[PDB]
Design a binder for this molecule. Structure first.
Ligand code: ZN
Length: 257
């Protein structure tokens, strides 16, 4: 019964999930001046041409667009990563207002929303095994700002009426996640965690410098989703973000000068 309310929100998670106060929790504030350029970091390789989207699900904390991860169809490699990471799902975090919603911040700036493309290390065979490993996941984080519409997001926006409440799913085939990527793949990277319970410290974070722009109408449709099940009291799914956590003994590295 964790969530994002006053009584069950991020400040309470540590009671069920003591790793919430751990040494490598996410998100964090990215202090751009103190991040270190690392000239040996490789370009990212984002290989999404054979991606197979399957379904979209309202899980009661976000919506997930799920992919076939039973073969190397949509993979992330390079950058800070060793090996091959398969795309399993993406989801967003967003706010009730355009001035908040992101999990990571950049020099304390909050964006309207943040996209997470979640990938697991194929050396561990499945996602459930991967989350138990320090190098199990690679999450590509992309900020959303409100401005012009993002045409590559509209197929997601349009299906949200079909998954309004918790536990609802809908077929969601032939969605191309390349339409959600900014022009530049310049990034910051650091070791961290899942940002939702169980908060496992299994993630190599790769946060893109360049945000994507979405329209007011698009983000408004995110905000009409519900945290609750059908026939339960309506609570709008908004402010489903965890705030920045202490950096502790970590250095954020940049792929760019
Ligand atoms: Zn997330």
């Amino acid at each position: 019964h964790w969530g994002y309310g006053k009584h069950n929100g991020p400040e309470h998670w540590h009671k069920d999930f003591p790793i919430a106060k751990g040494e490598r929790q996410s998100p964090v504030d990215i202090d751009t001046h103190t991040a270190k350029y690392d000239p040996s970091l490789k370009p990212l390789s984002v290989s999404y041409d054979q991606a197979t989207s399957l379904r979209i699900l309202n899980n009661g904390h976000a919506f997930n667009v799920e992919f076939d991860d039973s073969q190397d169809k949509a993979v992330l490699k390079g950058g800070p990563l060793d090996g091959t990471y398969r795309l399993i799902q993406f989801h967003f975090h967003w706010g009730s207002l355009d001035g908040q919603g992101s999990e990571h911040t950049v020099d304390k700036k909050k964006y309207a929303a943040e996209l997470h493309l979640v990938h697991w290390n194929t050396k561990y065979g499945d996602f459930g095994k991967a989350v138990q490993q320090p190098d199990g996941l690679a999450v590509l984080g992309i900020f959303l700002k409100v401005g012009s519409a993002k045409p590559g997001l509209q197929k997601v926006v349009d299906v949200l009426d079909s998954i309004k409440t918790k536990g609802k799913s809908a077929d969601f085939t032939n969605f191309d996640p390349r339409g959600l990527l900014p022009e530049s793949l310049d990034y910051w990277t650091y070791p961290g965690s899942l940002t939702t319970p169980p908060l496992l410290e299994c993630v190599t974070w790769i946060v893109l410098k360049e945000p994507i722009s979405v329209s007011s109408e698009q983000v408004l449709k995110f905000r009409k989703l519900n945290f609750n099940g059908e026939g339960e009291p309506e609570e709008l799914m908004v402010d489903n973000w965890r705030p920045a956590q202490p950096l502790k003994n970590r250095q954020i590295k940049a792929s760019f000068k």
